[PDB]
Structures are given as C-alpha cells and as structure tokens.
Amino acid sequence: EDKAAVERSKMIEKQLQKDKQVYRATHRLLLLGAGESGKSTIVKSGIFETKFQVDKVNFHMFDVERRKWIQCFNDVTAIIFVVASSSTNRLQEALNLFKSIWNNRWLRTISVILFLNKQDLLAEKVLAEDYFPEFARYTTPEDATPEPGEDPRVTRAKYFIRDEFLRISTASGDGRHYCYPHFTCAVDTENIRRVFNDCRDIIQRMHLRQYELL
Amino acid sequence: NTASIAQARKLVEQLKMEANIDRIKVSKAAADLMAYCEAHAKEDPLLTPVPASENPFR
Amino acid sequence: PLPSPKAWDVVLCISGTLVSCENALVVAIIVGTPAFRAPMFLLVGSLAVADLLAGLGLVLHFAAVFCIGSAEMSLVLVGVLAMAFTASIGSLLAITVDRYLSLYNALTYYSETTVTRTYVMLALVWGGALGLGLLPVLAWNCLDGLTTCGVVYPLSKNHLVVLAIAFFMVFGIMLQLYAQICRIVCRHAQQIALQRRKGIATLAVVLGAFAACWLPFTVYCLLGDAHSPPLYTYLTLLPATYNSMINPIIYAFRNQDVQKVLWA
Amino acid sequence: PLPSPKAWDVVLCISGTLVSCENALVVAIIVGTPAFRAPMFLLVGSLAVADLLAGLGLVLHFAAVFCIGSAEMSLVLVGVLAMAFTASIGSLLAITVDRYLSLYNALTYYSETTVTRTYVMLALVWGGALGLGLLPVLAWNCLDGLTTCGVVYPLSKNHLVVLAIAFFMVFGIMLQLYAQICRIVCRHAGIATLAVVLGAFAACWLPFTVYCLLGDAHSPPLYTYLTLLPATYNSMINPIIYAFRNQDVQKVLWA
Amino acid sequence: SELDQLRQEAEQLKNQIRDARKACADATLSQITNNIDPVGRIQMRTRRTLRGHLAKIYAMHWGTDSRLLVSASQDGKLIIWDSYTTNKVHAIPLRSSWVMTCAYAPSGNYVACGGLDNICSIYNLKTREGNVRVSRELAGHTGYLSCCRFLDDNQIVTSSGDTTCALWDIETGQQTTTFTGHTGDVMSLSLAPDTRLFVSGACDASAKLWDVREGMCRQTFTGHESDINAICFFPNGNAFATGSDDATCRLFDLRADQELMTYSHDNIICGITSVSFSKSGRLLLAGYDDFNCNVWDALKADRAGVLAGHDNRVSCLGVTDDGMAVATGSWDSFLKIWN
Ligand SMILES: CC(C)Oc1cc(Cl)ccc1CNc1cc(-c2ccccc2)nc2ncnn12
Ligand SMILES: CC(C)Oc1cc(Cl)ccc1CNc1cc(-c2ccccc2)nc2ncnn12
Ligand SMILES: CCCCCCCCCCCCO
C-alpha cells in the first residue's frame, strides 16, 4: 500500500508548492507604536494584522518587556515606527525605545519608516518644546522645504524634532539599513504612497549594495 | 499593603518549606548515576554503531 | 612531417588551459550545493560553462594540430570555438540585462516571471550560439574555394562581417543599459548624500575591460583580408581569450556568498 | 558637357530638389513664429536644417559636376553631403531620447536642466557630424594614390567602414529605447507608430551601410546607385510624418 | 512591620539554607568520574535530511515510535514527516503566523501548537472525513506560549511569558491549577519521565522545581547569571541540565541542591538554544548559536565532538524514543536527520 502513501506525499508536496508560490508574492512590515501616537489613524488575539494593496502588489502589516519577541521579525521588509510630536518628556521615552531598537545586535537588515505624527498640536503649542537645552543651540537646515503658511519657529521645531531620530540612526549601521522621515499630521490621505515608495527604495538599495556598486 | 504582605508571607512559607529538605550526599548520587550508565551503556547506538542490517536509516 | 609550433601558439595554449582550470573551479563551486539554484547564479553558471567549452576547445585544437598530426578534425574545433565565444557574449549580455530588471522591478522580483524571463533569454542565447557555430560548417565555408577566405585560415569574409555587426549591436544595447543603471545609482547616491562617488567606478572598469578585450579583434578584422601578416591574428585574438580570465573573477568571486565557500 | 549625364543622376537630382523644397516649407513655418522654444520645437529644427542641407548639396553637386569642371567643388560638395547625411541620423536618436525622458519623468522632466540637456545633445550631434564629415577633405582621400578607397570614388574604405561601425553602434542605443518605451507604456499605463518608425529607419538606411563591408571596390556603379537611392527616400519621409502631424505646424501656417 | 521583619527572617533563612547546602556537599563528581574510560570520538552524519519548509523552524517533538516527526515554522504550516522515506502524511494550515512551540501526543493521536497567539489550540487526527479540523481552543493566558508538553491524552501543561504555568483539560478546558513564583519569562518546561513532576527555566537567572498535583515549589536552583533557554530531565528522573546565553551548559542534581558540573569553554562565546541527553545519559548535546551542534561528555566535561553542518541558527534538538536519531532543526527550513 506504499503506492497510496507516495501519491499522498506527492499531492501534499504540490499543494505546498502552490501555497509557497502564493506566499512569495507579498511583503511584511512591523508597527512599533509608542502606545497612543494615533496607531488607529495611521492604519490607512494580541496579534492584529492588516492587508492593504498598492498597484496590485498586496502588502502585509501587523502590530505587536519587548526585549524578546523581536526575534520573530528578523525578515520584515521594514519597520513602520510611529512617533508622537507632542512633548512631560515622553518624547525621551520614544527616543530611548528607538535607540534600543537600533543597536538590537540581531536586527541588522531592517530599515525604519518614521511617521512623525500629530503636527497640529505641536504647531498650536509652539505658536501659543523648550525642555531640552539643545534646542536653543540649533539652526534650521539650509535646505529646508517648508510648505506654504509656516512660521520660522514652527519650522525650527519641526526640523529639530526630526534631527534627533536621525542624528543617531546614521551613526552605526555599516551601510546596511537607513531611516526615512515622512512628516505627516493627523491631516493627510496619501501616507499609503509614502510606504510603497519607501519599500521600493529599500529593496532597490539592498539589491544595489548586493551588486557592490555604491 | 495587602498584596505586599501576601507576597511576603508566601515567600516565608516557600522558604521555610524548602529549608527543611533532606540533602542526600553527592557521593551516592554519583554512584547511582554510574550504575545507571553501566546498566545502560550497551543500548547506546549513538555511542556503539550498528550495521545496516538493523539500521533502517540507509 | 609536421609543423614546428611557434611561441605565440604555446602562449595561446597555456592561456586556454588557465581559463579552463579557472572556469572548471568556478562551475564546481556553483554546482556543489543545491542551494545556489538562483537566476543570477544560474546565468553565472551558464557563463562559466561557455568559457569552459571555449578553453577546452582551444586546448584540444592545439593538441590536434602540432602534436597529433591531423587537420580534417580541426574544423569542428574552430566551429566549437565560434559557438563558445558567441555563447559567452550572449551570456554576458544576459547577465547585464537581468541586472537591470532587478533594479527596476524590485517589488515584483522573486516570482515565476523572472524564471520564465531567464529561461527564455538563456534559450535564445544558446540557440544563437549554436547557429553561429554551425554556420562555418555549412554552405558558407571557404574550404571549397568558391568564396574569399578572411584573416582566419579556415574562415571566410561574410561570417566575420555578420559576427562583427551582431557584436556591435549588442555593444550598443549594453551601453544603453549601463547608462540607465548609472542614472538610477546616481539618484540613490544623491538621496543618501542629502542627509550628510564609488557608484560609477565599477561600471567604468567593467565597460573598459570588456571594450579593450573584445573591440580590437573585430575592428582589425573588418578592415582586413586574407593577406595580412601572420602575427596580426594572434595579436588580435590574445585579448579575446584573456577576457575569460577576467570575466569569471569579476562575476563570481567579488560576490560575498561564494567567497566564504572558496575560503574553505 | 563631356560627362553627358544619364537617367540615374537626373533621378537623384529630382529627389534632392523635392527634399529641399519640402524642407524649406517646413522650416519656414517653424522659424516664422519667434515664440517656439520648447524642446521639441528646437530639436526638430536641427533635423529639418540638416535634411535641407543634404538635399541642397545633392542638387548643387549634380548641377555643378555636369555643367562645369567642379572637381574640387565636387569634392567639397560630397563632403557637405556626408555632413548632412550624418546630421540627419545623429539627430533622430537625440529626439527619441528626449521623448523617452519626457515620458518617463512624467512630472519631473520640466525644469531648467531640460534646456541644457537639449543644448548638449545638439552640440554632440553637430560635433559628431563635423568629425565624420571632415575626413573626405582630410588625410583620408581616394584621390591620392594607393588607398584602395571604398564603394564610391572619393571615399576611403577605412573612412566608410568607420562610419558604418559608428552607425551600427548608434543602431543599438536607439534599438533598446523602443523596448524601454514599450515597457513604460505597458506598465505605467501607440506601439504601432513606434514600430513603423523603427521599420522605416532600418529598411531605408540599413542597405547602404551593409553594402560597404561586404564589397570593397571596383564594383559596378549600378549597385551603388540602387543602394544609395533609399537614403533620399528616408531623408524625404522623415519630416513628413515626424513633425508635420501635430497642430504646431498647420496652426501657424494657416494664420 | 509592613515588610521589614519578613525580609530579615527570609534573609537569615536563606543564609542558613545555603550554609547547609554547601555543608551537605563533599566534592564534585569530577574526581569520582575521572577514572571512567573517555570513550572519545563520536560518529554521526546525515541520512535523509528533510526539506520543504517555507521559513525558519522553531520546535519539533519526536513521536512515540521514533519514526514520526512534527515541526512548525513562521508560515502557519504544521506538517507531519516520516524519517524513513521523507513523505508528508498530513499538513496542517494554522491561523496565526508566529508559532513558537510544538508537541506530540503520547498515543500519537492529538497534536498541539501555539506561539505568539496567546493560545494552545490542538488538532485531532481521527476525523471521519479524513482531514484535520481544529479542536477546543484552550485559551486564557496573558502571553506567548513557549512550550506545551503532554502529561496524558487529557491534560496539557503549558508555559507563558507572563510568569505562569497552568495545566488544562480537553473535556471542557479550565486551568485547574496555576503554578507561580517566578519573576521573568518561563522559557521552557521539561516533563518528568514518570509524569509525576516537572521543571521549568525562567528568564530571571533561575529554574526552580515544581510539583505535579499541588503546585507547590519545593526547591531553588540559582544558576546561570544570564537568561535560560532549555531544560531536560535525566533518563532516571534524578537530574536535569540547563542551558544559557553565556556559552555555559551545566547540569544540576535534585539531591545536591547546588551546581554539579560546568561545560564552559572560552573558544566560542555564542549563545545556547537547546540541550539533550544521550540515550545512555553520557553525552550532552548543545545547540550553540554558531550553527555548530556540539556534543559534550556528561562526566568528563570535555568536548567529545564538533559535529555540525548547518548554515542558519540551530534551534531544535532532541533524541528519538530509543536511540534511532538525533534530529536537529535549524532556521533554513531543513530538518537534518542525523545518525
Ligand atoms: C538579449 C535579447 C534577447 O534581448 C533583447 C531583444 C530585443 Cl529584440 C531588443 C532588446 C533586447 C535587450 N533589452 C531588453 C530585453 C528585455 C527582455 C524581454 C523579454 C525577454 C527577455 C528580455 N527586457 C528589457 N527591458 C529593458 N531592456 N530589455
Ligand atoms: C545621443 C547621445 C548623446 O546619448 C547617449 C550617449 C551614450 Cl554614450 C549612451 C547613451 C545615450 C542615450 N541615453 C541617455 C543619454 C543621456 C544624456 C546624458 C548627458 C547628455 C546628453 C544625454 N541621458 C540619458 N538618460 C537615460 N538615457 N540617457
Ligand atoms: C558621451 C555621453 C555619455 C553619457 C553618460 C551618461 C551620464 C549620466 C549622468 C547622470 C546625472 C544624474 O544627475
């Protein structure tokens, strides 16, 4: 009766091959939300997954002390880390979490997709923050690209809160993974096209470095 | 306070129970380990290889 | 009564042996594990196989002229050399082309589309190589005396002309492909440098090596007839064979993967 | 009077004259309006001017060689004919490249760098035309003795083989651009017109460049004439379907 | 006296406890076992290495006949193997995609699973229609399931990253007991040979004893100064060996109440991921992070072998029911049956 066993084995093998062919089409992402930084608005038992699509290239995103289960996401395409721009020094907690996630010692092929969020509150507070003494000893970048209707203080704050998560990102990475600020606010609708482009960019960079050009 | 005193007392009972436990000397424990090893030192294919006659892994 | 070999023939034979040995080593490394069944590695293996055929044919031809007295079988040897060279050029073009559809379809790579593309492209390359190797063993041969022999003793004029035209067209395609790859690399390098120029040196080196290794033979073959000084053919064909000692190292050793296996 | 022309030279002169007339009436429309400075507007001007120069040189050479002892004048006129025939081929690639870049950079092409890109393309095209067309009045020349010149009289074989190599290389840089255009069109978002343009170019200017590598010299002029005839047809047909289709020309001409 | 007197009395109790502990020890077994013959070289090599997984593997449990074998990877695929002809009798599609545990029934009928889904679902293999369907989803924990063995066909001990260890039932499903006392994460638990006890190794640099029917800790085994990742009993039900991340395997005895023997060498400073005794209880098999499946001598405390061959990290380990294989699972979707 071994013939039946072999036939069943071959049928399971072909089914597994088809399932793998389906599987090797989509990408994976991780969301290390700070806890309350609009984790529900940027969506545009414990494990919760979402499945959106861009240009027919179906993606795969899912959300989650955390010192251990990072091991299960060694192959994610990128990390969609979501910060809150309202500082209370919880921004220091977010910076510490980012620092810990950077020199993980195991995640050395993962790039972070930053999503500085809730800019309206920052604008209201600054117009109407100053805890860090380093803010005074700062200047706006010479290549600023402010959208119309911006105050110099607002731009200074916006480009100083983004200069803390990159001053450490591009410090020890041996040119294997990078950071990509994409300032957003509760007000936007095309963040889904700031993820697709960044994923394409990361994969292209990885291939280019594999070919040993740059 | 209730949680703190509860955990403290629980630690108290755990410590007192595990304190009054017989501690067999290492010598005869090692003797028993040696006896088991020798009594089962022959049925060790991982240490005594066998021919293909009774080795389905071929 | 057999001819006395000249020094240039010995140089060609030793270069062929070295190429054969290196390509044999590379193909042995590639075929050593079933885990290297990747499109790029498959194309690299095809390139290594073509270069191995070229080297083996060259050494067999040398051993079948000046050591084993015979000339009727050498025609098949020259045909094999032509097939191997055409296959090598086609495989190099294939590798260059696949290097651009992975830097532009980064979100659709790792799919049956790539497998189909590489299969079809390899099949076309080997079919063209077979055709170009069969042509010198067909009605268009200079042995019958009803045609004009060229700068190569058993060859003719038409075959060399068509080969040169095909090579020039392929050279143009490769030039365009790099140009595009250089554009993309420059864009990425500028984006990286935004948040404070090695992305072009490798392209220049590879293109210069390929040009300086292949162009002279065709260039001095087109404007030539079957009366040029004998040493011209050897001087123009030496770089063509030398190219097989620089192709495999660049395309299968600078990789960080095979290097570890080589170290063992 | 001694040459006593034949039919083929008359046909060549007629083709050149028609090319010149069409080219003049097409360049007059473009130059009439002083507001035309778009990349296409400036680009098509070079093609029109070069094709006009080709036609004018052909007609003038035919008239002069058969009416006066235009030995040196015939040499210079053949040099100018080579100039114009190289310009008409080196410029189509530039416009194809410009169209591809404008079609791929959908929203980023429009900038100041486009003007510099077009200017450098024009400079390269004209410089290559000058370099290739200078040889007939330069070191290489059939009228010197022991040079085994090529298919036509005052054209060294080496010079024409170099020209053929250069054109064949340019036939690759332009061959993959059509494939890239098809790729972009089918992916991001027509094929027939591109295919027809490629086929016309290849069919009507390949035969001459392949009929100098095979043959060397001392061949009947009949084959030379029959192989050079399609060049004039290409020279005429290019501007007819290349730039005389959009409203850009008719709108200005009518008013 | 909110907490003062209790801490002082606990401190003095611990002081006299480990005073007696050190006093109750004569000497290490090294000199006792140094006379035994150092058998030396060990011979093993692959037989029918199994492949066909889509992603890296995390666990595997040998059947009760040394033939079957089940493994799970990060693709929701739990499939049954047969290390005699490399077939695939049954393939089970899961619901989550980050499983981190596997188990096999003692009767060979039921199959469990779990992982980062905070659940311990099981499946039955006696379906009338012939397929496999989900069974009672035993849930209620507050963390990721780490290991879940089988006491019997009706009871299934479990673990958790929330410092909990509670057995369940299949008839209805309820935690009739809840062992507690750790502080960190309970990495793994080893089921007693006679199904009357078990041990567990937490992430707080300790691995304490546990009862089977009253959930009363009755011993402490302060050991490695780092995390733990594995634990396994001795075939006689008298001792267990514990791994760590500092590249130091060591064996603890249930009678000495203290450390017995270390297996640390400074040549490799990587981490361990598994441990497994030889069928004769003489060789200790390590799971070093350097892809090397090292083997140690249980008594000589010397490197008895360097058998290896994997490429990705080695996670699983174990031994067949009766000296038939040493199957090792890695992250390369390859199960390498070694003999
Ligand atoms: C080597 C030869 C067979 O390939 C060519 C053939 C022609 Cl007729 C023209 C040009 C090329 C090389 N350019 C090319 C080919 C392909 C491609 C498409 C289908 C199957 C395999 C390859 N895709 C491309 N994308 C950008 N260039 N490009
Ligand atoms: C006509 C000739 C000048 O163009 C080429 C020359 C070579 Cl050697 C290779 C290829 C091409 C055409 N591809 C090309 C050119 C240029 C470009 C850059 C600088 C100045 C002018 C043009 N940019 C491009 N971007 C995408 N293709 N591409
Ligand atoms: C002679 C023509 C050589 C063309 C080389 C292509 C140059 C690419 C420049 C890219 C610049 C991007 O900012």
Explain the overall architecture.
The complex is a heteropentamer, with one copy of chain A (214 residues), one copy of chain B (58 residues), two copies of chain C and one copy of chain E (339 residues). In chain B, 55% of the residues lie in helices and 0% in strands. Chain B has 58 residues and is an all-alpha fold. The N and C termini of chain B lie far apart (66 Å). Chain C is mainly α and 264 residues long. In chain C, helix 6 (201-222) packs antiparallel against helix 7. Chain C has helices at 7-31, 39-63, 74-101, 112-134, 158-194, 201-222, 230-252, 256-263. Chain C is built from eight helices and no strands. Chain C has one domain: Rhopdopsin 7-helix transmembrane proteins, CATH 1.20.1070. Chain E is mainly beta and 339 residues long. Chains in contact: A-C, A-E, B-E, C-D. At the B-E interface, helix 1 and helix 2 of B face helix 1 of E. The complex binds ligand A1EM2 (2 copies) and 1-dodecanol. 1-dodecanol binds next to helix 5 of chain C. One ligand A1EM2 sits between chains D (93-94, 97, 101, 117, 120-121, 124, 173) and C (175-176, 179-180, 183). Chain A: It is a lipid-anchor. Chain A: Mg(2+) binds at residue 40. Chain A: Residues 113-120 are annotated as: G4 motif. Chain A: It is an enzyme of class 3 (hydrolase).
Q: What amount of the residues of chain C lies in strands?
A: under 5%
End-to-end separation of chain C: 50 Å
Superfamily (CATH H level) name of chain E: YVTN repeat-like/Quinoprotein amine dehydrogenase
Hetero groups in this structure are: the ligand CC(C)Oc1cc(Cl)ccc1CNc1cc(-c2ccccc2)nc2ncnn12, 1-dodecanol
Shape of chain C: globular
Which second-level CATH architecture of chain E applies? 7 Propeller
GO molecular function (chain C): G protein-coupled receptor activity; sphingosine-1-phosphate receptor activity
Membrane topology (chain C): Multi-pass membrane protein
Family (chain C): Belongs to the G-protein coupled receptor 1 family.
Main location (chain C): membrane
